[PDB]
Structures are given as structure tokens and as C-alpha cells.
Design a protein around this ligand. Sequence first.
Ligand SMILES: Nc1cccc(CN2C(=O)N(Cc3cccc(N)c3)[C@H](Cc3ccccc3)[C@H](O)[C@@H](O)[C@H]2Cc2ccccc2)c1
Lengths: 99, 99
Amino acid sequence: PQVTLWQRPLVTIKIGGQLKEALLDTGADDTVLEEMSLPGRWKPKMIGGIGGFIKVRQYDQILIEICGHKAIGTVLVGPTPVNIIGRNLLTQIGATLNF
Amino acid sequence: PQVTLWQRPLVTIKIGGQLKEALLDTGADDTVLEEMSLPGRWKPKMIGGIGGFIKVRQYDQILIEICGHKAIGTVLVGPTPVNIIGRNLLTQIGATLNF
Ligand SMILES: Nc1cccc(CN2C(=O)N(Cc3cccc(N)c3)[C@H](Cc3ccccc3)[C@H](O)[C@@H](O)[C@H]2Cc2ccccc2)c1
């Protein structure tokens, strides 16, 4: 669908039997989910953000269902304020920005 | 234009008489630009992301051109590594995000 940006673009995701809401984020290279039980199998990783690095864990090959859209990639879970879908997954959903 | 998200969506702004590139970022509600020479007065403000919070200076009523499209709005300037165009300008140049 077409999201305007008057309001944060949120979407519902399903992920490991859990239902969440997450920001569709084009500046984020990586999807970051706040803490969750994902079964695995993860390595650690640190990403940077605005003013600081966080230690996050990398799960790979995780089915996410974002709107009616199944996709699979890496998600990182970690102590984020807000769950964020970045461009590793936005490219699978076929997201576009238009201006 | 339409940009797909296979790489970072970066566009040139002209601001303050200066040319820069900035990220177009749907997930940011404010624009945050690395440290630069902008005139005016400004107020202290603190903003948070991943990692935590930065204090930026806030300037208001600033002319940005982002591709060939002018915008006036609040620009926060401060320590960030990436200059971000966030929803407040993005709304004005009419970006939409579609999938
Ligand atoms: N790799 C990666 C994955 C996930 C998140 C980030 C880090 N980000 C942020 O810190 N943000 C704070 C940010 C950035 C700009 C403006 C504001 N208002 C906030 C928000 C995400 C966010 C966090 C918390 C609350 C709301 C949103 C922004 O929407 C994201 O695009 C990037 C912007 C960015 C900063 C530094 C380096 C690269 C990219 C990076």
C-alpha cells in the first residue's frame, strides 16, 4: 500500500508466533527487534545508531510476515526503543520510496 | 523519483549555502544533520535513538532543498554520523512509501 508520512509508518509483523508492530525504516540497514524469544542460534553483533552502539544478537534466516508478506532474513534482537524493519527486508517486500 | 532500497537512499541537500548528502529516513521523525555552519539562534534539545541520546541544537524555519524541491522546517544539528531527513521534511516534499 501507499504510506504517507504524516504518521510513523507502522505495520504489523508476525514473527515466531508473535504479533508485533514495527516501523518501516529506510534509513536502517538492519531490522532490529526488541527482545523476544526467538529459538536459536544467534551470534552477537553491535550496530551503531544515533549516539551509540548497541550489542544485539544476530539471528539468521528468520521468517517474518509483514502485512500479507512472507520474507526471510536476518533479524537482530536487542535493546531498541522501537522495532524497526530496515532495508534488508524492505527490499524483499518490494518497498519503494517515491517523492 | 522513485527509489528502491537496494542501497541507501541518499540525496543531496543544499543547506546554509552548503552542499551535503543526507539519508531519506522514514523512521526518523526529525531531521538531524552533522555539525555545520548554520546561522541563527537555536535551542538545546536532546533526542534519542539506538544507542541513546544526543543533544543537538535546534534551528527552525530553515530552507532546505532536497532534490529540486525546497522545504522550510526545523533542523536539528548535532553529533550524528549521517545527516538524516526525517518525516517532518519528508512530508513536505511529498514522499510516500509504497509496497
Ligand atoms: N543500522 C541501523 C539499524 C536500526 C537503527 C539504526 C539507527 N537509527 C537511529 O538511531 N534512529 C534514531 C533517530 C534518527 C533521526 C531522527 C530521530 N528522531 C531518531 C532511527 C531509529 C529510531 C530509534 C529510536 C526511536 C525512533 C527511531 C532511524 O529511524 C534509523 O534510520 C537509524 C538512523 C541511523 C543513525 C546512525 C547510523 C545509521 C542510521 C541503524
